[PDB]
Amino acid sequence: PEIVDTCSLASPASVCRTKHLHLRCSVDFTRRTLTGTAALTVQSQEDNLRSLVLDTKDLTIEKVVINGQEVKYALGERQSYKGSPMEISLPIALSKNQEIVIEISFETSPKSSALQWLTPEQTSGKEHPYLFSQCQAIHCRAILPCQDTPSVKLTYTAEVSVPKELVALMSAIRDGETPDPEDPSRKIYKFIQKVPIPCYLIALVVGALESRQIGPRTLVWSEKEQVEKSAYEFSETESMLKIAEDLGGPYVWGQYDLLVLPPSFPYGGMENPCLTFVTPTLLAGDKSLSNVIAHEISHSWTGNLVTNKTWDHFWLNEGHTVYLERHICGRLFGEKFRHFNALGGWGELQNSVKTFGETHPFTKLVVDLTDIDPDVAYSSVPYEKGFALLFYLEQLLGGPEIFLGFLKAYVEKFSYKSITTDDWKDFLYSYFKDKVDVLNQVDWNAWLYSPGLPPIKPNYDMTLTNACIALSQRWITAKEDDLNSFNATDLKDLSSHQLNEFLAQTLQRAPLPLGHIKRMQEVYNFNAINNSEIRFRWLRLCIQSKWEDAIPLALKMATEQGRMKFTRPLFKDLAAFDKSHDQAVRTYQEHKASMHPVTAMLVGKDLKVD
Ligand SMILES: N[C@@H](Cc1ccccc1)P(=O)(O)C[C@@H](Cc1ccccc1)C(=O)N[C@@H](Cc1ccccc1)C(=O)O
Ligand SMILES: [Yb+3]
Ligand SMILES: [Zn+2]
């Protein structure tokens, strides 16, 4: 089938394939640049190959060397968020399967969309600066020239020169450290990734990092001030990894370390191989937000081993990971708990479809991302519509034990490969060939290609959800004369997850009367809850219900951390409230330069500014 990666301007995998990258670079904090060489080992997939094209974005190319000599290259015109193509003229034509090494000298821009450079004042320690990357989806080309498409998988080695007071880490096994032979104020850290990965999984952090061991194959890394809290927060990681291995097969990556980033990290987690990145907004104090780690761990099979061939097929990465994530939680906390989370995920799917509109092309499972920035299209849809389809199939095909056997087999079949929705579907029909009649009842075209809510809602146990719905409806249907009957005892039999779901339910019906929201603070004292998910929902409820007192609390949360799940809707809610609109816009303008590049772009679009 003719599948191209419409988000890449590089030569496709049918023309040539990168096999290995050897990255030698130096991190320059005074200039905010990464400098050095990327040597790509490339295999021709064609006869008489004489040129190839690489993805770049805001990179300065000094030179390209093949067989010890400089070769001609040309940078094409920028194609907005896709960057500029780099055509390289090979010095000798290559036969099919012939491999050569191309060494490219380059330097990044300070405005690389892959990178956030943090001043010492943006860190916990306040002495040293800090750098972290975020390559997914198509930002690797903003760090190094590459075939920036998940259809191509490579191994890599790297040597990273950094100020000696600082530590470098990568999505790779640590392979030693030395003083820098060309500067005794610098150290070189070395890295090896022996399992082939798509380039979106290359990751780098440089900062004042310490580690603590928390399991036989896990260290947690953060600035010194966060280490003790992180070790406790994530102490269940080894248990979860064991359950994940039971579901998916051997963990093949060696180490499973965790890095807790500074507050501007845009995501809850990122599944960088060997080194999952996490937001410090997870540090609730009671391990209640551990589903993020379950999700990242699950990507070590679905995403990192079996990878989407192009971003149009992103739901294969996320839907299966959610499905695995919810099984880990179900093993740990019971099947009624898995149904609670699944039911919550349907509510999130309703929110996202309501927000985009029920005919919008982004609510489709398989999307067409030609001339669409993946960062713009990013939503809960591939997560929850993908999970729903899997949960529906589970129920159709005979239950969780049966469907988990399909999942283990799917992972074995496609490990180390990149696949499309049609590969998945073909294998699903192969695996369940004795149930094809059942499969043929599925409305494939609706599920995979039609926008809006799915054509069929799965069955959900409601047991843990009922108390949330009941309390939410009491508040929604309350009149002024009913407010007196609410009391802090209403909350006594609710877990933190149930409190979150109470606020989610109520938020879906927002605004509530201002008197209701004030009563809620009076009796539940939600302003005191530090848990970031609960606090985020409470603040949105307060702002959407037009409570002015909440304006400074909402602005503070929106700006003191940068997790987009929180910062984007808080800014949007503050902009839609007339009392805070000017302050929202002004606060964005003031903070923008020190925000993450991607977060700044999206919040900017959300507010209709710059
Ligand atoms: N590959 C990572 C996703 C990614 C990063 C960069 C470019 C493309 C794709 P990823 O590992 O699933 C991150 C996920 C991790 C996650 C998802 C669901 C449950 C738990 C964890 C997460 O961070 N999503 C947000 C909230 C959110 C969920 C779903 C849709 C939109 C927003 C958050 O939690 O801030
Ligand atoms: Yb009444
Ligand atoms: Zn994910």
Closest CA to 419 of 344, 553, 312, 284: 312
Q: How far apart are CA 602 and CA 376, in angstroms?
A: 7
Q: Which ligand has the minimum distance to the alpha carbon of residue 484?
A: 2
**Beta strand pairing status for 218-222 and 257-260?**
parallel
Q: Which residues contact 523 (CB under 8 A, 6 or more apart)?
A: 486, 487, 488, 490
20, 498, 539 from 486: Cα distances, Å = 63, 17, 20
Q: How far apart are CA 15 and CA 54, in angstroms?
A: 12
Can you name the residues that pair with 174 across neighbouring β-strands? Answer: 191
Q: How far apart are CA 379 and CA 351, in angstroms?
A: 11
Closest CA to 305 of 218, 245, 395: 245
Contact (CB, 8 A) for 118 and 129: yes
Q: Which ligand has the minimum distance to the alpha carbon of residue 477?
A: 2
| Angle, helices 564-576/551-560, rounded to nearest 10 degrees | 150
**Cβ-count burial of 512 within 10 angstroms (0-12 exposed, 13-18 middle, 19+ buried)?**
buried
> Radius of gyration (Cα) for the chain, nearest Å?
25
Q: How far apart are CA 246 and CA 240, in angstroms?
A: 10
User: 315 C-alpha to center of ligand 3: Å?
Assistant: 9
Contact (CB, 8 A) for 67 and 127: no
Contact (CB, 8 A) for 59 and 144: yes
Q: How far apart are CA 346 and CA 327, in angstroms?
A: 16
> What residues form the annotated binding site for Zn(2+)?
295, 299, 318
Tokens of 120: 């010492």
Phi-psi region of 379 (alpha: psi -120 to 50; beta: other; left: phi over 0): beta
Q: How far apart are CA 478 and CA 247, in angstroms?
A: 46
Q: How far apart are CA 541 and CA 564, in angstroms?
A: 18
User: 345 C-alpha to center of ligand 3: Å?
Assistant: 14
Could you tell me if the CB of 298 is within 6 A of ligand 1? no
Question: Tokens 């043929």 label which residue?
Answer: 440
CATH architecture assigned to 15-207: Sandwich (2.60)
Give me the sign of the Cα torsion angle 259, 262, 266, 268.
Answer: positive
User: 483 C-alpha to center of ligand 2: Å?
Assistant: 10
Could you tell me if the CB of 275 is within 6 A of ligand 1? no
**Beta strand pairing status for 153-163 and 16-28?**
parallel
Contact (CB, 8 A) for 25 and 35: yes
Tell me if residue 429 is catalytic: no
Minimum-distance ligand 1 atom for the alpha carbon of 303: 1
Resolution of the coordinates in A? Answer: 1.9
Question: Tokens 């280490």 label which residue?
Answer: 227
Contact (CB, 8 A) for 366 and 312: yes
Could you tell me if the CB of 318 is within 6 A of ligand 1? yes
Nearest-5° Cα angle at 576, 572 to 581: 90
The residue nearest atom 19 of ligand 1, judged by CA position, is 292
Question: Tokens 């303008």 label which residue?
Answer: 589
Question: What are the residue ranges of CATH 1.25.40.320 in the chain?
Answer: 462-610
Question: Tokens 């099984």 label which residue?
Answer: 327
Is residue 444 classed as helix, strand or coil in its secondary structure?
A: helix
Considering only the C-alpha atoms of the chain, give the largest distance between any 2 of them, rounded to a whole number of Å. Answer: 85
Tokens of 395: 């129920």
Contact (CB, 8 A) for 443 and 454: no
Is residue 487 classed as helix, strand or coil in its secondary structure?
A: coil
Q: Which residues contact 247 (CB under 8 A, 6 or more apart)?
A: 301, 324, 327, 328, 404, 407, 408
What's the distance, Cα to Cα, between the start and end of the chain in Å? 42
Residue 266 per-residue DSSP state: S
User: 472 C-alpha to center of ligand 3: Å?
Assistant: 30
Is residue 213 classed as helix, strand or coil in its secondary structure?
A: strand
Give me the sign of the Cα torsion angle 222, 224, 230, 235.
Answer: positive
Q: How far apart are CA 217 and CA 173, in angstroms?
A: 12
Q: How far apart are CA 238 and CA 523, in angstroms?
A: 39
Query: Does an H or E element contain 246, and which?
Result: helix 237-248
Tokens of 28: 């320059």
Q: How far apart are CA 194 and CA 416, in angstroms?
A: 12
Q: Which residues contact 131 (CB under 8 A, 6 or more apart)?
A: 27, 29, 115, 116, 117, 118, 204, 205, 206, 207
Question: Tokens 């290609």 label which residue?
Answer: 449
Closest CA to 494 of 480, 481, 505: 505
The residue nearest atom 21 of ligand 1, judged by CA position, is 292
Please state which CATH number belongs to domain 305-461: 1.10.390.10
Is residue 254 classed as helix, strand or coil in its secondary structure?
A: coil
The residue nearest atom 16 of ligand 1, judged by CA position, is 292
Query: Does an H or E element contain 314, and which?
Result: helix 314-333
Q: How far apart are CA 257 and CA 273, in angstroms?
A: 9
Of 73, 130, 323, 383, the active-site residue reads 383
Tell me if residue 189 is catalytic: no
Question: What are the residue ranges of CATH 2.60.40.1730 in the chain?
Answer: 15-207
Of 296, 325, 384, 394, the active-site residue reads 296
| Angle, helices 564-576/597-607, rounded to nearest 10 degrees | 20
Could you tell me if the CB of 137 is within 6 A of ligand 1? yes
Residue burial 234-255, b: 16+ Cβ < 10 Å; e: rest: bebbeebbebbeebbbebebee
Contact (CB, 8 A) for 106 and 59: yes
> Please, which experimental method was used?
X-ray
Q: Which CATH number fits domain 462-610: 3.30.450.270, 3.40.605.10, 1.10.3720.10, 1.25.40.320?
A: 1.25.40.320
CB atoms within 10 A of CB 131: 20
Minimum-distance ligand 1 atom for the alpha carbon of 564: 35
Is residue 81 classed as helix, strand or coil in its secondary structure?
A: helix
Could you tell me if the CB of 378 is within 6 A of ligand 1? yes
**DSSP strands (E only) in 228-326:** 257-260, 269-270, 275-278, 306-308
| Angle, helices 578-591/564-576, rounded to nearest 10 degrees | 130
Minimum-distance ligand 1 atom for the alpha carbon of 299: 11
Q: How far apart are CA 440 and CA 600, in angstroms?
A: 45
Helix runs in 514-561, H state only: 514-524, 532-544, 551-560
Chain CA centroid to CA 74, Å: 33
- Amino acid identity of residue 472, one-letter, is S
Could you tell me if the CB of 295 is within 6 A of ligand 1? yes
Question: What are the residue ranges of CATH 1.10.390.10 in the chain?
Answer: 305-461
Size of the chain in residues? 610
Q: Which ligand has the minimum distance to the alpha carbon of residue 318?
A: 3
Chain CA centroid to CA 331, Å: 24
Q: Which CATH number fits domain 208-304: 3.40.190.10, 3.30.2010.30, 3.40.50.720, 3.90.650.10?
A: 3.30.2010.30
User: 289 C-alpha to center of ligand 1: Å?
Assistant: 13
- Amino acid identity of residue 316, one-letter, is L
List CB-based neighbours of ion ligand 3 within 5 Å.
318, 321
**DSSP strands (E only) in 350-488:** 417-419
The residue nearest atom 4 of ligand 1, judged by CA position, is 136
The residue nearest atom 1 of ligand 1, judged by CA position, is 270
Give me the sign of the Cα torsion angle 580, 585, 588, 590.
Answer: negative
Q: Which residues contact 250 (CB under 8 A, 6 or more apart)?
A: none
Tokens of 507: 């938020």
